[PDB]
Swiss-Prot record:
It comes from the Eukaryota. Belongs to the Fanconi anemia group I protein family. It is found in: Nucleus; Cytoplasm. This is Fanconi anemia group I protein homolog. The lineage of its organism: Eukaryota, Metazoa, Chordata, Craniata, Vertebrata. Homodimer. Part of a FANCI-FANCD2 heterodimeric complex that binds and scans dsDNA for DNA damage. Interacts with FANCL. Interacts with MTMR15/FAN1. Interacts with POLN. Interacts with UBL5; the interaction promotes FANCI homodimerization.
């Protein structure tokens, strides 16, 4: 495999040849298992190294994150899951330590890019198009994270590397929100794309994080870092909601924020009855 990588550096990334190499490395990841860790890691790197120069891995990560999630099981101790057909790599022995960290590492690279982009846009007092891209990217690997946060991971390094990645996505999200705090001062309206995948975090992410976070301390008997990144994320939605147009934060706390209840209201007492 070390030869195959050295040789595939010579392929023109645009070439019909390059495509073959990639699609074949997909086939090999697709149809074979081999619980030996050192290999599957190298195979995965090959695959990713090529994929990265074609289209962004976010789709692949989401796919693998569903195998890792399906094979190792869930936190609830009972939920039914699996999808094998994604990739034949990721066995029991494969995914738990190995594909897990390798997938996280890859996810962190995708975020450094989105970080880079968000950084680039703000640097400017064609651009709107980069914004829609930043979203789908984030949105996709939001589903990716939603998958591992439901997985029962080997506790040693896979718990903490997930927690690292988990707080990195919230930083990126935070700055993207902090980005629109710049753009909303001039005009102030929020693209559905942003509103929708802002509530994507309030449904598939934040609530799922919190239960993984408590699963970590019950299984036991980084963590405080995730918490911080989260609060700050909400903090700047708070600033963005009142400082642009829409209420973003009613997408996020859907449980506690409407709880304490009192019969009817003053509005209903007067307007309707007598």
């Amino acid at each position: 495999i070390a030869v195959l990588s050295t040789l595939s550096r010579l392929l023109e990334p645009t070439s019909p040849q390059f495509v073959q190499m990639l699609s074949w490395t997909s086939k090999i990841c697709k149809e074979y298992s081999q619980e030996d860790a050192s290999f599957c890691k190298s195979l995965m790197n090959l695959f990713f190294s090529l994929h990265v120069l074609y289209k962004s891995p976010v789709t692949l990560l989401r796919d693998l994150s569903q195998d890792i999630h399906g094979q190792l099981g869930d936190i609830d101790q009972d939920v039914e899951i699996e999808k094998t057909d994604h990739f034949a790599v990721v066995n029991l022995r494969t995914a738990a330590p190995t594909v897990c960290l390798l997938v996280l590492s890859q996810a962190e690279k995708v975020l450094e890019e989105v970080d880079w982009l968000i950084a680039k846009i703000k640097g400017s007092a064609p651009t709107l198009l980069i914004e829609k891209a930043i979203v789908m990217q984030l949105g996709t690997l939001v589903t990716f994270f939603h998958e591992l946060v439901q997985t029962a991971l080997p506790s040693g390094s896979c718990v903490d590397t997930l927690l690292k990645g988990l707080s990195k996505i919230y930083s990126t999200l935070t700055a993207f929100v902090k980005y629109y705090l710049q753009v909303c001062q001039s005009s102030r309206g929020i693209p559905n794309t942003v509103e929708k995948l802002v509530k994507l975090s309030g449904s598939h992410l934040t609530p799922v994080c919190y239960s993984f976070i408590s699963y970590v301390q019950n299984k036991s008997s980084p963590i405080p870092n995730l918490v911080f990144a989260i609060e700050q994320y909400e903090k700047f939605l708070i600033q963005l909601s009142k400082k642009s147009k829409v209420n973003l934060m009613q997408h996020m706390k859907l449980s506690t924020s409407r709880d304490f209840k009192i019969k009817g209201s003053v509005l209903d007492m007067v307007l309707r009855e007598d």
